[PDB]
Design a protein around this ligand. Structure first.
Ligand code: MG
Ligand code: NA
Ligand code: NA
Lengths: 211, 210
C-alpha cells in the first residue's frame, strides 16, 4: 500500500489503481513455502484485510491485488475469497503460481511474450495471444508486469500494443517500471552521482537491477 | 424396359449451386435389390466406451418390415477377422418409449467388448457386424452387414477428441471429378486419390459439397 495521499491524487487526476497488499516471499524455497503454511495465514490476512479496511472507498482503486512473488498456497485462496466476500465492487488478482491460478479473476502474467512461448515447468509463461485461447479459459489478460525498461530497453514494445488492440481479451498491462531506483552519493569533491546496488559496501547485491 | 426422363434443370438446382462444372444425367450406379418380404429395413451401430477405452458396448438397433411373428429374431454378431468376439440374440419388441408403449418392430442388441481394437486414421482397425434376421428355430431370412470401427468422437473443453485424444486435421477438400468421365467416379481413381493423399501426409477429407 502507498502513502495515503497518493490515492486521493489518483482519485482527483484520474488514474485506475491496483492496490496491493504488502506480501512478497520471493526468496523462499519453494516460493510458496510460507503462503501455503497455515501458520503464516494470520500475518498475511492482516496485510490484506487492513489494506481493504483503508482504501475501499477510493474510486481510483478498481482492482485488489493479493501481493507479489510468493508462489501459490492455500492462504491466497482463503484471502481471495475474503475480499470477494467483503467487497464485490472490485476484481481480485494475483500473478503467483502461474498467473492464472484459482486465486485470480484476471490472467496477469509477468513478462509473457507476445508470440513466443516460454514453457517453464509447473509455471509456464505462454505467449499472451496463445494464453487466452487455452482449453476452457475465459478470463481477461492484463499483464501485471511487462516491457522491462532497464537501461537501453523497451525493444518490441510496439508488438504488445498491436496485439492489445487486436485481441479484445488482451486488455493491456503495466510497464515495469516507472522510475530508476538509483540513489545520490557524493564524490571526494562533493559532486553528486547516481548509485546502485553494491555502492554502499552492501553485500551480497544485485547491482544495476534496481534501475 | 425402363424409361428414365432425366431433367437438367429443377427446383433442386437452387440448392445445388456448387463451384464446379454443371453437368447432368444418370451419373452413378444403377442396381436391382431383391429383399425378402419380411426384411431388415434399417440398422444403427453405436459404440460407447469407459474412461480409458478398455471396455466398450456395441449397441445395434434393428428395424424390420413384414408381418410380426413370435418366432422372429435378430442376431447381431461381431467379428475380428474370423474370430467371433461377441454376439446377441433377441426377439422383436423394443423398450417402452411412451404412453402407447414401444416399437413392436424394433429390437436393440448390446454386445460387451473387452479391450477393443480402436479405429483411427493411424491404425484403421475394423471389426465386422453381421445382422441376421431369422426364425428362432434357425432359418435365415436375410443377413445384412457392415464394417465397424471402435472409435469415439467428442468435443470436450474446446478440443475435438478422437478416442480420448486431440486431433490435428491435415485435410483436403476433394470434389468428385474425372477429366474424361466428368463426375462419374470409379474405384481405380478413388484409390489412386487415397494413396496419394496418405502419401503426402493427409489424414482427412471433406466431402465438398455433397
Ligand atoms: Mg460457392
Ligand atoms: Na484488447
Ligand atoms: Na529490478
Amino acid at each position: 500500500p502507498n502513502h495515503p495521499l497518493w490515492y486521493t491524487l489518483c482519485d482527483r487526476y484520474g488514474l485506475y489503481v491496483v492496490d496491493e497488499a504488502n506480501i512478497e516471499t520471493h526468496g523462499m524455497v519453494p516460493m510458496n513455502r510460507l503462503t501455503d503454511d497455515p501458520r503464516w495465514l494470520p500475518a498475511m490476512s492482516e496485510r490484506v484485510t487492513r489494506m481493504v479496511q483503508r482504501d475501499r472507498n477510493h474510486p481510483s482503486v478498481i482492482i485488489w491485488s493479493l501481493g507479489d512473488e510468493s508462489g501459490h498456497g492455500a492462504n491466497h485462496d482463503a484471502l481471495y475469497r475474503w475480499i470477494k466476500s467483503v467487497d464485490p465492487s472490485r476484481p481480485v488478482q494475483y500473478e503467483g503460481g502461474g498467473a492464472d491460478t484459482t486465486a485470480t479473476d484476471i490472467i496477469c502474467p509477468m513478462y509473457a511474450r507476445v508470440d513466443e512461448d516460454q514453457p517453464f515447468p509447473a509455471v509456464p509463461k505462454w505467449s499472451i495471444k496463445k494464453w487466452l485461447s487455452l482449453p476452457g479459459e475465459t478470463r481477461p489478460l492484463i499483464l501485471c508486469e511487462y516491457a522491462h525498461a532497464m537501461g537501453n530497453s523497451l525493444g518490441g514494445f510496439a508488438k504488445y500494443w498491436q496485439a492489445f488492440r487486436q485481441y479484445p481479451r488482451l486488455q493491456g498491462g503495466f510497464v515495469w517500471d516507472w522510475v530508476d531506483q538509483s540513489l545520490i552519493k557524493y564524490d571526494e569533491n562533493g559532486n553528486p552521482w547516481s548509485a546502485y546496488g553494491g555502492d554502499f559496501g552492501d553485500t551480497p547485491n544485485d547491482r544495476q537491477f534496481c534501475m | 424396359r425402363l424409361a428414365v426422363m432425366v431433367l437438367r434443370w429443377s427446383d433442386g438446382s437452387y440448392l445445388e449451386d456448387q463451384d464446379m462444372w454443371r453437368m447432368s444425367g444418370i451419373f452413378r450406379d444403377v442396381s436391382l435389390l431383391h429383399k425378402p418380404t419380411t426384411q431388415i429395413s434399417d440398422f444403427h451401430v453405436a459404440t460407447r466406451f469407459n474412461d480409458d477405452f478398455s471396455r466398450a458396448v456395441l449397441e445395434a438397433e434393428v428395424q424390420m418390415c413384414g408381418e410380426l411373428r413370435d418366432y422372429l429374431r435378430v442376431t447381431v454378431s461381431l467379428w475380428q477377422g474370423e474370430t467371433q468376439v461377441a454376439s446377441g440374440t433377441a426377439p422383436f419388441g423394443g423398450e417402452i418409449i411412451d404412453e402407447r408403449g414401444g416399437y413392436a418392430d424394433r429390437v436393440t442388441l448390446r454386445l460387451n467388448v473387452e479391450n477393443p481394437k480402436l479405429w483411427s486414421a493411424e491404425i484403421p482397425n475394423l471389426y465386422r457386424a453381421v445382422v441376421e434376421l431369422h426364425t428362432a428355430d434357425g432359418t435365415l431370412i436375410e443377413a445384412e452387414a457392415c464394417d465397424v470401427g471402435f472409435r469415439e468422437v467428442r468435443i470436450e473443453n474446446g478440443l475435438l477428441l478422437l478416442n480420448g485424444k486431440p486431433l490435428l486435421i491435415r485435410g483436403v477438400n476433394r470434389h468428385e471429378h474425372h477429366p474424361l468421365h466428368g463426375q462419374v467416379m470409379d474405384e481405380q481413381t478413388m484409390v489412386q486419390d487415397i494413396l496419394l493423399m496418405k502419401q503426402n501426409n493427409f489424414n482427412a477429407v471433406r466431402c465438398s459439397h455433397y
